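Summary for the steering committee. One of the milestones for this cycle was to obtain a three-dimensional model of the protein with magnesium ion bound, which we needed before selecting residues for the alanine scan. The sequence and ligand used are listed below.
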Amino acid sequence: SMNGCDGDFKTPLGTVETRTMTAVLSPAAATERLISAVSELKSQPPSFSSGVVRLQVPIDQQIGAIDWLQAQNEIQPRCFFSRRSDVGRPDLLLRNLVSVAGIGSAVFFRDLDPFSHDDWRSIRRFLSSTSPLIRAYGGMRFDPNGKIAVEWEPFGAFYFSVPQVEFNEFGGSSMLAATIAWDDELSWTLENAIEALQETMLQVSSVVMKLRNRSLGVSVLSKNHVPTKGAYFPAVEKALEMINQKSSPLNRVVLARNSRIITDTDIDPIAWLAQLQREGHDAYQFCLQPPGAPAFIGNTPERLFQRTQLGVCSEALAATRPRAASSARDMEIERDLLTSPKDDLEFSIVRENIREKLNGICDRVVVKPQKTVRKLARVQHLYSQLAGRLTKEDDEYKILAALHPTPAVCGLPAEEARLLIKEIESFDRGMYAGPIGFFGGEESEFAVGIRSALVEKGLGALIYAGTGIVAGSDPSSEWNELDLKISQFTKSIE
Ligand SMILES: C=C(O[C@@H]1C=C(C(=O)O)C=C[C@H]1O)C(=O)O
Ligand SMILES: [Mg+2]
């Protein structure tokens, strides 16, 4: 492929364009027609020294993108993204993509230095408002200045990629697409790109089985935590005095745990993700797997931001109490959350901090509601949606730079929290609690990379979770909460 960060981001490409083929009925037909479209393009090519050409075949059937991805060979990077069902909740910004899978890279974007405005421009060079589905999938480290552990090395400080071949799932139809990207200045010519693409296309599988199985077929040989429970309690104790004494301004710090599971045979991360998706309501599903890397997957409720043209939306998601088995206990826990003066104050400093980030960029911000409880499968959180209008679409980078990270995954004051995390946590968060999603021309959307796992062949998996330590947090209670948060992974692996 080619690293678009190496490109001349101030010089526009020769073209960025989408070509739609006649619709077919099945994925096997789509794969054959797409092979033919790439061939025809090779024989009647564009002649620019740089460009992006997306060729897409509509499929009349509704096919799950994760089922298509499951059928594919290990052609990396592997991408997956499915936005939230957003059931019943208002869309404050007042054909839609249900899921997308990608294999290979038409162009990728990676650096060891933090994602910068120039990097954002480098990606924007490959997108266009008139090609809405040309999108770059990936994310950014929680802390792009932290020490990178080896398991996170392939991800860099950030990793994005336009798929070589992708499957788009819509409400009542689907689409197979392939993307040709090239830049002679980077010694990745149109002929290089077409040749790489034609090899991948002959490897694409149309045996798209509809998956059902609950058994992943792996035995867990051990489970250990970093930190262990014996190291965690003192760490939370240390944070709690910093908060309650008047030497440290700390009011909130999110402290995380890496739960390591060793398996005999390799976990299939796409199969695992597929099982979280059928059981995951109102959540983002994602996979990011750079070449030669473990697969970063997640099923997260939390939006960092969504942008549609000039409208930007984010949310404040903080505090955690468990769900209860009985209806009366569940409601009592919920009312406790909604009425506690302490929780109100702790949630407010999160909501108001995010509100003002948006307020610094948008003319005016809407907050709705001020405070409710968002109920998930095993936990429930306090919650608030915040939306604002950009003056210009190019302010997208400002949104991203202002919001990541919010106090929901880092803390307050940000400076003192971020450095306590650096000193207390002995593992690399990597892209856990980092932005994960995609850039597009007129639309971009990023989840917060929580409720996620790193899945490594020949090893097993790292399962991540954190909790907000605030005045009055109970170490035993928070430890139990970390177990509840990773429970969607630990149950389904069995
Ligand atoms: C840190 C994440 O949880 C986050 C921290 C919130 C809290 O303060 O409890 C709850 C929702 C998330 O924003 C995680 O689940 O790993
Ligand atoms: Mg807490």
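Key point for the committee: Residues 220-284+294-493 form a domain with the Anthranilate synthase fold (CATH 3.60.120.10).
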